[PDB]
């Protein structure tokens, strides 16, 4: 329960991710794609990879659905919550949110297995890497792997000023509190609750953010050292194993501070109507 | 069985064959479909895994597919070298465990005609030292997998003391076999000539021994 | 390269208890589920067994729960199966299988099988007799009365280890069995190697190696 991110990016939708797993899938898929790149003649393996990742995916997510009863109930709890007894409607908001993860954490097993069958796949094609000379293995693999599957990514996240994301989810906070306080009831409550929610998912953001920014420039300086050069096998495989984990982790904080940017702005619109309703309507 | 597949389909060379499984939403409608090929004589493989996914190795003519509660395995540009049995296989829900298909054998057509590989020996140095003695007669590498065998002593026909062996599929595709004929030692030593008759495709090869 | 290898197959009575174990090699054998698959005598696969990375989770077929008992020991990179309460229907060829991937519930590895035979009758070891002679005059050993299955019979204490005819054992009116395995010697006039034929039934601990024809 304590690597468990919570997601709510539209409304009447939840979904959860469990992030060391999200980040020992991905860095699978690297090891795996840097694993087919490094001959040319093993390129067009990647339709079977892309094949498999698939399939463990879909394995992985059918494993999720098992908890969609309890999801459900947490969901329609929330809409009741933010769509205005309230100490009753949040206590059993804590219980539904509990019963969702026991249920997570009740498929442990499940999800490890899935994620074991993603290493095995990784390491046995990660293992059948040769080279023409051992003393001086080609690196085209980690070069091709990052230009078509990470540069795309650097570059959107480098298009982007995540630091002023989070000075604009500061101030809307910052805002939406001083009004609370300069007000003047069941409306009152519910903005508090929603405010508190924000708040939760801000510092998430601000968490992801920060790991961003470091990957960001790791990355960068990483792949420029690692490209247009040759190194013994022993050395070739440790700078793949790195590569890997730089961008599994650059990845998983990328795509939750998405989701979770997405989760913020989908909870403000119910404190700006709840807000307007409190005025105009009242 | 749980999952159904026909017993035996057959389709002629450098064309493609279907072998159906059938099963149940426990079973096929709910979980991965395994294909396994076994070779006479050899361990099985696995071919064909995730419903569709083709085990590294494998050759790109077999493929995979399910849809509902049915899964199928296809196999392109036949050759003879593919004949052997296939078998599906998933989980099932409701036994909590795996169901195999039962197996469909698989028959290449427009093999050529082969006759018999016939030998036939008589009882050895020891076995007569050790009041034994038996005939035996193998029979090897006739493609149409079907053979009479008939015993003969001194040319009358042998009734009594024959066990014969159902053929067998070998390596090469063409099918073996094998018949016994025992006797006292005494008996041996009172005929002059004891002949295996192997019939195969209305022609018969025969074989002689005499003590 | 990657390997399994059984061991422990044999004759038991019915009530009786027999043990298989499976040696891997070649891979990370504590990083995969562990398989038994068995196979009766001219009959379909039946799966048996499955079992985690480190034991915690089992999975029997429903004819076997109670039974038989499936282990591992991820230090000696062994699978085993313990096989108690022995019935009749358990007689068949038991391969040790890798289950990967897991979540497919696939067999993508086999071992080459071990002979398991749950029988009332009693082991008999077999006469091994010698098998006397286009230009290529052919000739072998009879393995005469044995149970039961298997019995393995090579040429490599002799020569021709790959053009060998190990015919398939017939299985008479007393129970018994007989095979024959004869070699198409290629220069056989009146010449010829060092051949012999390794026949050995393992349940009856008979091990005769048989040089039917030193020359």
Known sequence: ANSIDILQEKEGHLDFVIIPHYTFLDYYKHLSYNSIYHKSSTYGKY??????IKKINEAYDKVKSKCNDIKNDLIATIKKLEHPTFKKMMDEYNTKKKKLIKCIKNHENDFNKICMDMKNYGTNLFEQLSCYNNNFCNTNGIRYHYDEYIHKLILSVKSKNLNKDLSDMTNILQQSELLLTNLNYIYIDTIKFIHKEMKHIFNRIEYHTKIINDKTKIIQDKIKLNIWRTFQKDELLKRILDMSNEYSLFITSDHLRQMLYNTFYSKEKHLNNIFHHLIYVL | ????????????????????????????????????????????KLLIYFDDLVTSGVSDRFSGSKSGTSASLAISGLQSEDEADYYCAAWDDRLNGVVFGGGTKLTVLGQP???????????????????????????????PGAVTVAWKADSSPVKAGVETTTPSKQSNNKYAASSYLSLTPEQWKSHRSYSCQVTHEGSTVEKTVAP | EVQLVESGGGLVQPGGSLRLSCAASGFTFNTYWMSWVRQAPGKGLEWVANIQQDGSEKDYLNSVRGRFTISRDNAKKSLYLQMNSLRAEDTAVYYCARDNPASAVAFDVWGQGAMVTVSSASTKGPSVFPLAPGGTAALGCLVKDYFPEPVTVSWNSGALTSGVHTFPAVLQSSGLYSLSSVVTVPSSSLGTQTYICNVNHKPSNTKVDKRVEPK
């Open chain 2, 113 to 143: 005609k082969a006759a018999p590989s016939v030998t036939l020996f008589p009882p050895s140095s020891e076995e007569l030292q050790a009041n034994k003695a038996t005939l035996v007669c193998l029979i090897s590498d006739f493609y």
């Open chain 1, 47 to 52: 339709i079977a990879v892309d094949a498999f």
């Open chain 2, 1 to 44: 069985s749980a999952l159904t597949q026909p017993p035996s389909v057959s389709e002629a060379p450098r064309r493609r064959v279907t072998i159906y499984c059938s099963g149940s939403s426990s079973n096929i409608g709910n979980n991965a479909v395994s294909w396994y090929q076994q070779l006479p004589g050899k361990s099985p």
